[PDB]
């Protein structure tokens, strides 16, 4: 009580405990995070959002498929070549680390990790269309791990559609063996035959509801010797505006502390790219269970040690702080993002406490307003400060 951690902290999603494997072989894997809403009523409004983590070895290819869900794809580490196959055309995009791209629901696509000696790590925000809680991947490919969805149609339908005998269709499309799974390893020669065509990093990508964007290609919103914060919002990008989601990429050096702060209205889903950190989230809980009886809220403390691939949810308005125990970088999706205001609770810049008039501070706290202000102005830095460990 008063201090929840582990399974007692519903906002912490340990990567080795809360991810479900959709597919996995020796060339990579796809895992989906368990539902947010099933763990806490305080995440009920994240019910139509799922998080997917993808990782593949060098020279790999995720076979063509589409899903009944909108995807906001982000490359955490490595390089990827995303190809959107449309009914009458196709577009390839080279997505370097930090780049993101929206993939409308039902868009057939495939992507490759063109790197010869580096893995590819991607995180995707998924918004299911048919059932708000779950989506399904439809693979067109026919492998030992799955049958092409085309096999879903009867012989008569297939023959008339392809204008050929089923024996042939079956031999060519369903089965000259076939691949093991949806993730296959290609040779350098196979890559260039279509990769060298893809579109590399664009200029000011944040201007097309179809072109990928790099939130790192912008002036950090916060930046000092302890950390830097890059962020792209609905106000800055079309794809983001449609999803009403903002994206953040935060770098923090060992021993840095991201000061206590809260987002006014955005619900934040963060993922550790690399590094380790200690996080503290502050919530409230009513100890009075008799509805028609006076409420009685007590401060609740939710903590966790975050590591690579871990996911943590910061409900809107909940104060939070992060102490980087090693060089760190985390990414975050801000849901209900439009006009979000990040309120810091210490330091110089963006400190909402410093905007409170002296007289109000005086009655709000034990000490005089003068003394409260003296304490407030003690910290010389803003946003990120020295965690002063040991």
Residue 57 or 278 with smaller CB distance to Ca ion: 57
- Residue 90 CB contacts under 8 Å (≥ 6 apart), including other chains: 83, 84
Determine the distance from the C-alpha atom of residue 219 to the mean position of all C-alpha atoms in its chain, rounded to a whole number: 21
Q: Which of 5, 7, 153, 208 binds its own copies (CB under 8 A)?
A: 153
- Residue 237 CB contacts under 8 Å (≥ 6 apart), including other chains: 206, 207, 213
For the bound state, the minimum distance from the C-beta of residue 356 to Ca ion, rounded and expressed in Å, comes to 12
For the bound state, the minimum distance from the C-beta of residue 192 to Ca ion, rounded and expressed in Å, comes to 7
Q: Which of 27, 71, 110, 222 binds its own copies (CB under 8 A)?
A: 110
Residue 219 or 363 with smaller CB distance to its own copies: 363
Angle at 114 between CA 141 and CA 203, to 5 degrees: 110
Is 114 annotated as belonging to a binding site? yes
For the bound state, the minimum distance from the C-beta of residue 222 to its own copies, rounded and expressed in Å, comes to 12
Q: How many CA atoms lie within 13 A of 271 on its CB side?
A: 24
For the bound state, the minimum distance from the C-beta of residue 116 to Ca ion, rounded and expressed in Å, comes to 4
- Nearest Cα neighbor of 110 from 131, 134, 93 is 93
Q: Which of 79, 107, 201, 202 binds its own copies (CB under 8 A)?
A: 107
SS3 at position 31: strand
Q: Pick out residues in 114-133 that bind Ca ion (CB under 5 A).
A: 114, 116
> What is the rounded distance in angstroms from the CA atom of residue 153 to the CA atom of residue 138?
14
Q: Which of 173, 201, 221, 327 binds its own copies (CB under 8 A)?
A: 173
Residue 119 or 190 with smaller CB distance to its own copies: 190
Q: Pick out residues in 50-109 that bind Ca ion (CB under 5 A).
A: 59
Please work out the total of residues on this chain that contact its own copies, with binding judged by CB under 8 A. 152
Question: Is 85 a residue that touches its own copies (CB under 8 A)?
Answer: yes
* Helix boundaries (H) for the chain: 155-162, 166-169, 188-195, 238-243, 358-364, 369-376
Instruction: List binding-site positions for Ca(2+).
Output: 114, 116, 362, 365-367
Give the footprint of Ca ion on this chain (CB under 5 A).
59, 114, 116, 188, 191, 362
């Amino acid at each position: 009580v008063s201090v929840s951690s582990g399974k007692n902290n519903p906002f912490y999603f340990n990567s080795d405990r809360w991810f479900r494997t959709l597919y996995r072989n020796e060339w990579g894997h796809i895992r989906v995070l368990q539902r947010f809403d099933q763990r806490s009523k305080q995440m009920q409004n994240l019910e139509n959002y799922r998080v997917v983590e993808f990782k593949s070895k060098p020279n790999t290819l995720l076979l063509p498929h589409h899903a009944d869900a909108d995807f906001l794809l982000v490359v955490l580490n490595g390089t990827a070549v995303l190809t959107l196959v449309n009914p009458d055309s196709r577009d390839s995009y080279i997505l370097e680390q930090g780049h993101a791209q929206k993939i409308p629901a039902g868009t057939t696509f495939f992507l490759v990790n063109p790197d010869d000696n580096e893995n590819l790590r991607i995180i995707k925000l998924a918004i299911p269309v048919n059932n708000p809680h779950r989506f399904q991947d439809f693979f067109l490919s026919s492998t030992e791990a799955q049958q092409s969805y085309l096999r879903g149609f009867s012989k008569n339908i297939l023959e008339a559609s392809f204008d050929s005998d089923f024996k042939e269709i079956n031999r060519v499309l369903f089965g000259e063996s076939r691949e093991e799974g949806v993730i296959v390893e290609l040779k350098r020669e196979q890559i260039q035959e279509l990769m060298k065509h893809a579109k590399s990093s664009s200029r000011k990508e944040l201007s097309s509801q179809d072109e990928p964007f790099n939130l790192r290609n912008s002036k950090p919103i916060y930046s000092n010797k302890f950390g830097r914060w890059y962020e792209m919002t609905p106000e800055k990008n079309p794809q983001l505006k449609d999803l009403d989601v903002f994206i953040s990429s935060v770098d923090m050096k060992e021993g840095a502390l991201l000061l206590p702060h809260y987002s006014s209205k955005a619900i934040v889903i963060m993922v550790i790219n690399e590094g380790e950190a200690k996080i503290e989230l502050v919530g409230l809980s009513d100890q009075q269970q008799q509805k028609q009886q006076e409420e009685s809220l007590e401060v609740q403390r939710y903590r966790a040690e975050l590591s690579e691939d871990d996911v943590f949810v910061i409900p809107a308005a909940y104060p939070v702080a992060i102490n980087a125990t090693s060089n760190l970088n985390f990414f975050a999706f801000g849901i209900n993002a439009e006009n979000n205001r990040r309120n810091f609770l210490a330091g110089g810049k963006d400190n909402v406490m410093s905007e409170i008039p002296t007289e109000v501070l005086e009655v709000s706290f034990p000490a005089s307003g003068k003394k409260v202000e003296k304490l407030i102005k003690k910290q010389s830095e803003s946003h990120f400060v020295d965690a002063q460990p040991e």
